[PDB]
Amino acid sequence: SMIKIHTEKDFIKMRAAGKLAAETLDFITDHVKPNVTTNSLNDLCHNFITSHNAIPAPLNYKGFPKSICTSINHVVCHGIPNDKPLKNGDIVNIDVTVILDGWYGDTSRMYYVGDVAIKPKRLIQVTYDAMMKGIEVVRPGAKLGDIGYAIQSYAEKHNYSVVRDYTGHGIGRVFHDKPSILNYGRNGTGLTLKEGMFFTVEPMINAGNYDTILSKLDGWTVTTRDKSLSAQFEHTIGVTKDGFEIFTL
Ligand SMILES: [Mn+2]
Ligand SMILES: [Mn+2]
Ligand code: NA
C-alpha cells in the first residue's frame, strides 16, 4: 500500500481542521445531559460545523444518515443519532469529522450523562490512557505494530479487552486512507513510521469480552456481543522529526 508523505503546508491545513473538530467537541459538552436526545446533539454539531465554513464528513458517507456518530453504553462505535432520551448514568462517545478547505480532522471523546458510577468512570479512564500510550510510541523509525502493542498491553493489563475489527487510518485530503492503524499487535512488527505521515489512533475498549457485532439491520451500529460497556477516544496525529503532533486539540 502507498503511504502519502506530507509537507509543512499540509501540516498547516491539518492543524486548522483538527482544531475545528476539537472545538466542536468542546462546544457540545454542556449540551450533554439527561433527557436530551442524540438527534438534538447531531443538529447542534451539524450547525456548529457548517457555520464555521466546514462540512461534516459523516453525512451521507457510504449512506450514513447523520452528521456525527453517537455511541451510548454497550454501543462500541458508529452509533446513529436517534430520538431516544439519554438517561442519568449513561456514557456516550461523540465522534466528529470536519472537512475544512479540503482537509479532514477526525476526533472523538467520552461524555458523562448526569452522575456516572465508578465502573463506567474507570473504563473511560483506561481507554483514554491506552490511546495516549499508542500515540506516545509514534516517531520516525518506530513500527506500526508498536502502536497496537502499547494500546493492547495497557488495556489488557488493566483488566479490559481490545476491540479488533475497527481500526484507525491514514487521513488528509481523504477520510480513510492507508494504512490501517490496528489497536492490537506484536511489538516491532509492520511498516516503518516516517516523518510526514498523518493518521488516526482510535481504540475501543470493552469492560467485558472483546467480541463485537455489526447490526445487519442498520448496517452501522456496532455493539458488544456480551452487552458490556465499551468506550473510545480518537485523535488525528502527524509524524514529526521529534515524534508526534496531535492536530485535534
Ligand atoms: Mn472518528
Ligand atoms: Mn477515524
Ligand atoms: Na460505548
From Swiss-Prot:
A divalent metal cation 2 binds at residues 106, 169, 202, 234. Keywords: Aminopeptidase, Hydrolase, Metal-binding, Protease. Its EC number is 3.4.11.18. CDD domains: MetAP1. Substrate binds at residues 78, 176, 220. GO terms for molecular function: initiator methionyl aminopeptidase activity; metal ion binding; metalloaminopeptidase activity. It holds the Pfam family Peptidase_M24. Binds 2 divalent metal cations per subunit. Has a high-affinity and a low affinity metal-binding site. The true nature of the physiological cofactor is under debate. The enzyme is active with cobalt, zinc, manganese or divalent iron ions. Most likely, methionine aminopeptidases function as mononuclear Fe(2+)-metalloproteases under physiological conditions, and the catalytically relevant metal-binding site has been assigned to the histidine-containing high-affinity site. GO terms for biological process: proteolysis. Its cofactor is Co(2+); Zn(2+); Mn(2+); Fe(2+). It catalyses: Release of N-terminal amino acids, preferentially methionine, from peptides and arylamides. Monomer. Removes the N-terminal methionine from nascent proteins. The N-terminal methionine is often cleaved when the second residue in the primary sequence is small and uncharged (Met-Ala-, Cys, Gly, Pro, Ser, Thr, or Val). Requires deformylation of the N(alpha)-formylated initiator methionine before it can be hydrolyzed. NCBIfam families: met_pdase_I, PRK12318.1. Belongs to the peptidase M24A family. Methionine aminopeptidase type 1 subfamily. This is Methionine aminopeptidase. It comes from Rickettsia prowazekii (strain Madrid E).
